């Protein structure tokens, strides 16, 4: 038998950001442009996470529904296992 673990984190670490983060970070993109471009109203509307509100990507790009209230980034959403399988 043995004991001893090593793992710490930085609590309350939200680096302020003057400019709004609008960099498509979704899993799959359909917009021909597939860039940080969005409209005021439409599927291609820049959507910011709800939990932390840091990530920013299109609507249909984040594989969401046409009747979704708010969307949350990955790190926030319950993703079984780390992105890097
Ligand atoms: Zn996108
Ligand atoms: Zn988030």
């Amino acid at each position: 038998g043995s004991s001893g673990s090593s793992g710490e984190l930085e609590p309350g670490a939200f680096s302020e950001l003057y400019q709004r983060y609008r960099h498509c970070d979704a899993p799959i993109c359909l917009y021909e442009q597939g860039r940080d471009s969005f409209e005021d109203e439409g599927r291609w509307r820049l959507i910011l996470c709800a939990t932390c509100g840091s990530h920013g990507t299109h609507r249909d790009c984040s594989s969401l529904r046409p009747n979704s209230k708010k969307w949350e980034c990955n790190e926030c959403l319950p993703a079984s296992g780390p992105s890097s399988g």
Side-chain angles (χ1 to χ4, degrees):
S2 199
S3 173
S5 170
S6 198
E8 294 57 63
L9 51 86
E10 284 208 88
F14 272 65
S15 165
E16 194 80 39
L17 310 150
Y18 305 126
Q19 272 278 9
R20 285 77 151 194
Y21 178 81
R22 64 150 202 279
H23 287 292
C24 169
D25 202 328
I28 308 288
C29 209
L30 312 150
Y31 207 57
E32 178 87 323
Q33 270 53 56
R35 88 193 32 274
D36 50 277
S37 272
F38 319 85
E39 271 86 48
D40 210 310
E41 283 157 43
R43 63 189 159 196
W44 315 122
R45 64 180 295 198
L46 175 70
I47 305 194
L48 282 181
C49 168
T51 299
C52 66
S54 286
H55 298 217
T57 195
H58 313 78
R59 198 275 293 289
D60 204 314
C61 186
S62 190
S63 197
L64 303 164
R65 282 170 208 165
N67 208 85
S68 184
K69 276 209 180 174
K70 273 200 87 72
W71 150 90
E72 287 149 37
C73 66
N74 161 46
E75 74 156 58
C76 279
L77 287 168
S80 286
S83 177
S84 287

